[PDB]
Design a protein around this ligand. Structure first.
Ligand SMILES: NC(=O)c1ccc[n+]([C@@H]2O[C@H](COP(=O)([O-])OP(=O)(O)OC[C@H]3O[C@@H](n4cnc5c(N)ncnc54)[C@H](OP(=O)(O)O)[C@@H]3O)[C@@H](O)[C@H]2O)c1
Length: 342
């Protein structure tokens, strides 16, 4: 009944591991180095947690050694390892190949060493494999769980963000293709999770560093920006709270209703300024130490970009998502409190 989770040192994954340990699962995480594993073991201080070292998911048969050692005990797999790096300079090598090869490697390791043992795979995809990046602000587009990013390999590399979104799209397509072609040989059922921009506190306060993971660095950077910084007030994207994401991944292997589902995790539109507005409203004593409030945002004019039809997802998951104001508040509070400022 052990649970394998790839890329276990990341922002989302550390919350998933917390949830797994709350529920008394035996957890095997993969991280890139023994230093990372050692630090994490001390953070959780939980005998049910172990780490195996997978230094590069893109490399040949990267997950075979794990299934050689642990094949018999791994009943569930959470495939969360994929690069989220909008500073990548080599878009093929740093984003697209690791996303795809990581996914192929995990599924082929399962097929070779535990085709009848692994019951469920929950894969972290993204809403990036559902939405169209240049239409995030297009109210004529309605997304649902059957919508696909139409990006092709030919136009994937327009910029770093389209390339990231393509890595997620192409990886997920390979996931469903594998499932299609191996229906009778491998018993696992797949569930894919599709978060939008993930905000919320780091799982451990000590992990609040000068620069955070890419998506929370949006908030962290605005929070530390000079008062005179120009902040955009036009619609940016959809968000979801990291704690909702983590909860969904664990439900993903537990609930039969989630078999063969793509789950679209969005809970609200925002601009940069809507984030800043939370700083000023909730920490008024620090006004002037970050950019100012301005209520003239796209959101407040009823402008939210592409439409999100995730009713099926919400009905399947049943639990209520965390609202934007709380997600931002909790992110900001953790940072300011760590800094000894509130
Ligand atoms: N944050 C979001 O808004 C968002 C939204 C939708 C989906 N997701 C997906 O959720 C997953 C984690 O995202 P995150 O925001 O938590 O980012 P993160 O904090 O940067 O987590 C990434 C984790 O994957 C590992 N990783 C990436 N590339 C790897 C590689 N080539 N080889 C081995 N390990 C690798 C990282 O290990 P190292 O740090 O040591 O490289 C890290 O453990 C990803 O699949 C992401 O695509 C994120």
């Amino acid at each position: 009944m052990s649970v394998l989770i790839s890329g276990a040192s990341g922002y989302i994954a550390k919350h998933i591991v917390r949830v797994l340990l709350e529920q008394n699962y035996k957890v095997i995480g993969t991280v890139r180095s023994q230093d990372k594993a050692d630090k994490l073991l001390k953070q959780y201080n939980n005998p049910n947690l172990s780490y195996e070292i997978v230094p590069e998911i893109a490399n040949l048969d990267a997950f075979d050694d794990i299934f050689k050692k642990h094949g018999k005990e791994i009943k569930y797999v959470i495939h969360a390892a994929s690069p989220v790096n909008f500073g990548a300079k080599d878009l093929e090598k740093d984003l697209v190949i690791p996303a795809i090869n990581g996914t192929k490697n995990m599924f082929e390791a399962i097929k070779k060493y535990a085709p009848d043992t692994v019951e469920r795979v929950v894969m972290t995809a993204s809403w990036a494999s559902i939405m169209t990046p240049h239409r995030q602000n297009d109210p004529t587009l309605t997304l649902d769980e059957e919508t696909w990013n139409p990006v092709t390999e030919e136009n994937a590399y327009e910029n770093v963000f389209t390339a990231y979104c393509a890595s997620k799209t192409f990886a997920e397509k390979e996931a469903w293709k594998f499932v299609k072609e191996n229906s009778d040989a491998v018993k696992f059922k797949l569930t894919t999770i599709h978060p939008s921009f993930v905000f919320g506190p780091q799982n451990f306060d000590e992990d609040v560093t000068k620069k955070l993971n890419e998506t929370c660095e949006i908030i962290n950077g605005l929070l530390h920006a000079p008062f005179d910084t120009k902040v955009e007030k036009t619609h940016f994207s959809q968000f979801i709270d990291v704690r909702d994401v983590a909860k969904t991944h664990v439900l993903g292997f537990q609930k039969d209703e989630l078999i063969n589902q793509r789950l679209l995790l969005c809970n609200g539109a925002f601009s940069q300024q809507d984030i800043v507005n939370v700083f000023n409203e909730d920490f008024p004593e620090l006004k002037g130490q970050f950019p100012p409030e301005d209520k003239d945002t796209d959101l407040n004019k009823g402008v939210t970009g592409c439409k999100i039809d995730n009713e099926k997802t919400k009905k399947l998951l049943a639990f209520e998502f965390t609202p934007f104001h709380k997600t931002i508040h909790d992110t900001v509070y953790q940072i300011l409190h760590k800094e000894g400022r509130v």
